[PDB]
């Protein structure tokens, strides 16, 4: 019964094609609730879940100003990191930032986090104690020295284990009719011949929330991690998720295979056999 609030930021330089594209999204658990897109018309932080719409004009103004300020910081940092990594001005580069906090079912703070990336690789991260940084390389250590001297971790910590928790608690109350619900996977198996002598068995998990789930194939007790096709968990688009796992088996031996399903919403793990 734990919950999370996370903000994701992406800035992408567009040399000669205008200012960097900037996209910010906020989630509670796996539910998006705010967005900002620099290429969108409104130029405002915008609601994306029904329970955030009740926030007042002061909230939307403040969130819009703060997210625009993040965009302006990233704009500067794109130039700075180009210098640190000795790159030219002609290429497109990417900064990604994620931060947020987890609370338990009783609302207590569990952990906070912040991680930054450059061109899709680790750049700098706040450590779990919220007091020290880990830089990924000698360039990122320049930033670390600057943030250590500016006592950035103390300011960030006050948000991650304080303000972040305050707002997450508020959102969980404001959105209780939806955020507290957990939808169990509906499971079935399908069978698809691929020749006269082999068939694909596919194990399906549908309509589940949250997205975390485990699907496993076993053959006569033993596992088949090397002979299993497993797709990425995917959104249905209605707020639930879907996944499947598949295995090619000899015709007439279907009974030797079992799919195993694990979801937080399942009282017991499900086992399916053809």
């Amino acid at each position: 019964g734990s919950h999370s609030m996370r903000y994701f930021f992406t800035s992408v330089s567009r040399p000669g094609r205008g200012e960097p594209r900037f996209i910010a999204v906020g989630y509670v658990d796996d539910t998006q609730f705010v967005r900002f897109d620099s290429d969108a018309a409104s130029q405002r932080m915008e609601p994306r879940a029904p329970w955030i719409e009740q926030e007042g004009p002061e909230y939307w103004d403040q969130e819009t100003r703060n997210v625009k300020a993040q965009s302006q910081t990233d704009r500067v940092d794109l130039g700075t990191l180009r210098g640190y990594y000795n790159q030219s001005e002609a290429g497109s580069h990417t900064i990604q930032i994620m931060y947020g906090c987890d609370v338990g079912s009783d609302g207590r703070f569990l952990r906070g986090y912040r991680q930054d990336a450059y061109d899709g690789k680790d750049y700098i991260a706040l450590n779990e104690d919220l007091r020290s940084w880990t830089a990924a390389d000698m360039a990122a250590q320049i930033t670390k020295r600057k943030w250590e001297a500016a006592h950035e971790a103390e300011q960030l910590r006050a948000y991650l284990d304080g303000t972040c928790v305050e707002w997450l608690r508020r959102y969980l109350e404001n959105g209780k009719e939806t955020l507290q619900r957990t939808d169990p996977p509906k499971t079935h198996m399908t069978h698809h011949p691929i020749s006269d002598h082999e068939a694909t068995l596919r194990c399906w998990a549908l309509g589940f929330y949250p997205a975390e789930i485990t699907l496993t194939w076993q053959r006569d007790g033993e596992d088949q991690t090397q002979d299993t096709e497993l797709v990425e968990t995917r959104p249905a688009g209605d707020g639930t998720f879907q996944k499947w796992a598949a295995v090619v088996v000899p015709s007439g031996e279907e009974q030797r295979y079992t799919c195993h399903v694990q979801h937080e919403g399942l009282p017991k793990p499900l086992t399916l056999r053809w």
Binding site: Q96, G120, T190, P235, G237
Partner: protein, 99 residues
């Protein structure tokens, strides 16, 4: 530094001809973030297609959902066409009801 998209084309609900549904194209695991995704109906670009706001996974790779309401007819062919710097030509993934 460049990761090619994984592409899945699927319906929101189990498909039944004549009945309104949603056609999804989920692209994930890619970097960098510039990507062109079109949904196709009998080879032609579908005009009213929405998409999610760009987000990313723990490994920093990006993912997007493109979607549109459709009514499946058993003669109409649907596909997702994806272009990305990792691809030589745009990849077309046809919708198969069993996947």
């Amino acid at each position: 530094i460049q990761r090619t998209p994984k592409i899945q084309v699927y319906s929101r609900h189990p498909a039944e001809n004549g009945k309104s549904n949603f056609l999804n194209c989920y692209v994930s695991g890619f970097h960098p973030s510039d990507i062109e995704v079109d949904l196709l109906k009998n080879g032609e670009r579908i005009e009213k297609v929405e998409h999610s706001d760009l987000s990313f996974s723990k490994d920093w790779s990006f993912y997007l959902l493109y979607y549109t309401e459709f009514t499946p007819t058993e003669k109409d062919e649907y596909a997702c066409r994806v272009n990305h710097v990792t691809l030589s030509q745009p990849k077309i993934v046809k919708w198969d009801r069993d996947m």
